[PDB]
């Protein structure tokens, strides 16, 4: 029970409820519906937002405190490839809410899949795909430098802005993104995120394939213990494959840092005409 600590932590990002106008439902999240909205800002402008709400039921003091912890966890993230907290509404209503920026094109996984259909985005070029990987690496570099562990890094948790920038986030199958040492023990480090980053790169390069076709979830641990890894996609440059492969080295200490991955990815992207 840390409700007093949490309210003091979130004080300077509290927002007046009446500045916010809610709109339609975007979907369901951990604690309830996610609405789109408009938020009138301090300087006088307007901003299209996503508003995370809590279910109408009497959700416990623990759920409320868990909800606000997540916001407090995000509060100081300031980076263009990391989702940012716009603020919170508490003290005017029975369930509080968290205000986030609107991500026009939604989650990256669904976007990759829609790009293979005529009606959605068009065919994504190789350079744009690489740029998505770069953005994610930039975001993860920032987070791992702050000692934040993601733990569920995947294309489905990455979000696309109006200008096609990727933001790392968590919405709140998954065995297939988990590093070998994290399956084997409870161990998570930044190097476990590196592994999940490699899988996300492979998702991006395959334009949204589920990792490890023909391997079922309950077979995964054994498959990885035998040293087997994701195969090279048919259209994937050898250099790009070498980069994703380095993310799955059995010893976490041998995997590259996010800085190194990001440098390697920028170099490959800039190497293309
Ligand atoms: C640490 C932390 C705490 C809390 C969060 C969080 O609350 N994120 C979060 C994310 C998405 C959410 O949903 C949507 C938001 C938008 C915006 N635009 N559009 C169109 C949307 C549609 C939906 C939607 C929901 N259902 N269906 C669709 C949502 F409600 C909450 C978070 O991400 N992190 C974090 C974790 C790891 C990092 F690297 C960085 C930050
Ligand atoms: Cl953002
Ligand atoms: Cl597919
Ligand atoms: Cl595979």
UniProtKB/Swiss-Prot annotation:
Q: Which residues bind ATP?
A: 26-34, 48
Q: In which tissues is it expressed?
A: Not expressed in normal B- and T-lymphocytes but is expressed in numerous neoplastic B- and T-cell lines. Highly expressed in testis, ovary, prostate, lung, and kidney, with lower expression in spleen, small intestine, colon, and liver.
Q: Which residues form the active site?
A: 152 (proton acceptor)
- Which compartments does it reside in? Cell membrane
Q: Where is the Protein kinase domain?
A: 20-269
The record's family statement is: Belongs to the protein kinase superfamily. Tyr protein kinase family. AXL/UFO subfamily.
Question: Quaternary structure?
Answer: Interacts (upon activation) with TNK2; stimulates TNK2 autophosphorylation. Interacts (via N-terminus) with extracellular ligands LGALS3, TUB, TULP1 and GAS6. Interacts with VAV1 in a phosphotyrosine-independent manner. Interacts with TIMD4; this interaction enhances TIMD4-mediated efferocytosis.
Q: What does this protein do?
A: Receptor tyrosine kinase that transduces signals from the extracellular matrix into the cytoplasm by binding to several ligands including LGALS3, TUB, TULP1 or GAS6. Regulates many physiological processes including cell survival, migration, differentiation, and phagocytosis of apoptotic cells (efferocytosis). Ligand binding at the cell surface induces autophosphorylation of MERTK on its intracellular domain that provides docking sites for downstream signaling molecules. Following activation by ligand, interacts with GRB2 or PLCG2 and induces phosphorylation of MAPK1, MAPK2, FAK/PTK2 or RAC1.
What is the disorder linked to it? Retinitis pigmentosa 38: A retinal dystrophy belonging to the group of pigmentary retinopathies. Retinitis pigmentosa is characterized by retinal pigment deposits visible on fundus examination and primary loss of rod photoreceptor cells followed by secondary loss of cone photoreceptors. Patients typically have night vision blindness and loss of midperipheral visual field. As their condition progresses, they lose their far peripheral visual field and eventually central vision as well.
Q: What is the protein name stated in its UniProt record?
A: Tyrosine-protein kinase Mer
Task: State the organism named in the record.
Answer: Homo sapiens
């Amino acid at each position: 029970s840390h409700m007093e600590e949490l309210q003091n932590k979130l004080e300077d990002v509290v927002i007046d409820r009446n500045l916010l106008i809610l709109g339609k439902i975007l979907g369901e999240g951990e604690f309830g519906s996610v609405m789109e909205g408009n938020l009138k800002q301090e300087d006088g402008t307007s901003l299209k937002v996503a508003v995370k709400t809590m279910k109408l039921d009497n959700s416990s003091q623990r759920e409320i405190e868990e909800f606000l912890s997540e916001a407090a966890c995000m509060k100081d993230f300031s980076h263009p490839n990391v989702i940012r907290l716009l603020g919170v509404c508490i003290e005017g209503i029975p369930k509080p809410m968290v205000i986030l920026p609107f991500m026009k094109y939604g989650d990256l996984h669904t976007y990759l899949l829609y790009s293979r259909l005529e009606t959605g985005p068009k065919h994504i070029p190789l350079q744009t795909l690489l740029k998505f990987m770069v953005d994610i690496a930039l975001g993860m570099e920032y987070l791992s430098n702050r000692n934040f562990l993601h733990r569920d890094l995947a294309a489905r948790n990455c979000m696309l802005r109006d200008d096609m920038t990727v933001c790392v986030a968590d919405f709140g199958m998954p065995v297939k993104w988990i590093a070998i040492e994290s399956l084997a023990d409870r161990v998570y480090t930044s190097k476990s995120d590196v592994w999940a980053f490699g899988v996300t790169m492979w998702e991006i390069a395959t334009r949204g394939m589920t990792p490890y076709p023909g391997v079922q979830n309950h077979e995964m641990y054994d498959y990885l213990l035998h040293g087997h890894r994701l195969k090279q996609p048919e259209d994937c440059l050898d250099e790009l494959y070498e980069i994703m492969y380095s993310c799955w080295r059995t010893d976490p200490l041998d995997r590259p840092t996010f800085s190194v991955l990001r440098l390697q990815l920028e170099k490959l992207l800039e190497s293309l005409p």
